[PDB]
Design a protein around this ligand. Structure first.
Ligand code: GUN
Ligand code: GUN
Lengths: 338, 338
DNA sequence: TACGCAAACGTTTGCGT
DNA sequence: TACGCAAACGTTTGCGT
């Protein structure tokens, strides 16, 4: 312990503490001795003691949903990098969209007194929004809303709507008029918001999407698989499909292949997320890219701000998706007619 | 603070503390009052203060390598589940195989006084093994060695060698005699160990692998891509390939497709890991499955043990891979001749 | 019966001189 | 000059009675 170090050095703990944090000038001679002891005694200064006094843990908490999913996984790795460099420690929490679970992690977190909170819960019911407020005191930012549901947080917005729009536009411009869509959960932003952006372009083009052509997924490859199936497993099928998430796309690809349908020669498919290895899908996936690192870094930043420069007001920063052309889309029947 | 609660309740903090932890009988009347205050004052008992006294943080640290990679990602989600249920908090650390980085996280961790340490560093150079020892005092288990490199840790072993063997055997038994291999980094267990297990079966079958047929990868889809290419991009090519990791396999698939080679009609491919969505690769990947949840849970368990029942001796538990047949393998030229 | 007083956990940091 | 004494951070837990 520090006392033990001070003794081996025959200096006061104050001195020990000062040399360890260079918070005041100490003589070389003195300072070496301290180091010496620190070394033999093999000292590890306790963060708990420290945090207890200085009042901050240099530790931040990520209340996510799941961390296996490619999408999430990439964001997280991002956030960790940032924590690491500004010297923060990341406490990861998966709540699986479970309220109970969510109230639990929130609670352990406050208790562990994290400096700030990163939230990525996918769906926000009032009960959740409500819980979150009970912690306005701990600084936080939600990284997955589409607009700013609340006033007690910072927020980074992904313009998912404008992504939906881009996707649809692309298909339209490639000659397609018979399109289907497998969207992600409507209770989520990246679900509802992308569908909507997609539907605007359709309506702008006077394209009507037969309900038998829209099939809900859940971002999981299985959902993709079933959706595609149900789509192509029908009398009249579209020539192209907009799928709200790369991993589901992955699944949508498999099924087509399984029905002996050729992509994109038989069906064109466009995804969304540009997950780390969508380029190695077969065929190489054409998708909308979501800035995951920037989404992370930007979030970590507004937090640190609030944390460091004691900011009180809610902030919000937009971020922008962009189209990545790969090999899963092919001209439609109307390309030549424009 | 607790003092503030005790006052609103006109009871001593001792009482407050007792009702909060039911560590001694308190009158209903009394106990309600406490709760009352706890409620208005909106109390969050500090874990730091607590940990400071009781000496444990109910918090565990995962020093990993990377957390985006499918493989790792799944293990982690596993470990978190377990932390959650036994009431521990997970602190995630990616060191990217960086010594400096590794010494840093190790250090922050000790400092943060984590109850135990989960290690998954992929490669273990003496310099790393050395650092690790300096922390024998903090309980730990490495979850990725093939045998027990040290005596100061628990260890879970994956029998990766017997996986390599199974893979090769399969190919042999399907009629293949001309096989190639794209292995993972030899400095890693899941790299070296699987190759070796694979090479034993070959030698048992008197199959010789021409060096021009073995190409190192790094578990990253790109490495897979290049490897396959180099393989098929040659006068004489094998009829089948053993690829040391599903994600590289994913890449190996893409490239074949890109050369207009058909899988498995032109080349047979077998992977390794059985990552969550290898079934949706195209074609559905035939691979060796690695028990990731059990790998996690088992690790979390030996830790808790050491943690709770103050175990001093090094333990080691094996785990077992098993073959999953999917659609990426086809009979070889010698099937009929056996 | 049912509960309090006070010391301790390991630091940091104000004043001293 | 260059450094010490002692109080404080927010708890838990031993003895009391
Ligand atoms: N798995 C997954 N992928 C996504 N991509 C966009 N939103 C999501 C989500 O909630 N889950
Ligand atoms: N990405 C990745 N996959 C693996 N599968 C087995 N070992 C590894 C590894 O070190 N990295």
């Amino acid at each position: 312990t520090i006392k033990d170090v001070a003794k081996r050095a025959n200096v006061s703990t104050t001195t020990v503490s000062h040399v360890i944090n260079k918070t005041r000038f100490v003589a070389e001679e003195t300072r070496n001795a301290v180091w010496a002891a620190i070394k033999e005694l093999h000292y590890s200064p306790s963060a708990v003691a420290r945090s207890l006094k200085v009042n901050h843990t240099k530790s931040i908490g990520l209340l996510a949903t799941s961390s296996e999913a490619a999408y999430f996984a990439e964001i997280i790795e991002a956030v960790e990098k940032n924590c690491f460099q500004k010297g923060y420690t990341l406490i990861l929490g998966n709540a699986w969209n479970n309220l109970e679970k969510q109230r639990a992690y929130l609670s352990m977190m406050a208790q562990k007194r994290v400096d700030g909170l990163l939230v990525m819960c996918s769906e926000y019911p009032e009960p959740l929004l409500a819980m979150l407020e009970e912690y306005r005191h701990i600084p936080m930012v939600v990284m997955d809303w589409g607009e700013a549901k609340a006033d007690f947080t910072d927020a980074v917005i992904d313009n998912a709507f404008e992504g939906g729009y881009m996707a649809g536009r692309y298909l339209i411009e490639r000659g397609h008029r018979e399109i289907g869509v497998i969207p992600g959960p409507l209770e989520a932003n990246t679900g509802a918001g992308r569908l909507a952006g997609f539907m605007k372009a359709m309506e702008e083009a006077m394209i009507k999407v037969p309900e038998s052509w829209i099939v809900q997924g859940d971002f999981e490859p299985e959902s993709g698989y079933r959706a595609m199936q149900q789509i192509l497993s029908q009398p009249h099928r579209p020539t192209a499909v907009f799928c709200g998430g790369d991993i589901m796309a992955m699944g949508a690809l498999c099924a087509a292949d399984e029905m002996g349908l050729r992509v994109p020669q038989d069906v064109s498919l466009i995804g969304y997320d540009n997950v780390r290895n969508a380029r190695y899908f077969t065929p190489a996936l054409t998708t909308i890219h979501q800035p995951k690192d920037s989404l992370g870094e930007t979030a970590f930043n507004m937090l640190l701000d609030r944390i460091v420069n004691k900011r009180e007001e809610p902030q919000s920063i937009e971020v922008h998706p962009r189209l990545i052309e790969r090999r899963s889309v092919a001209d439609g029947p109307f390309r030549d007619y424009r």
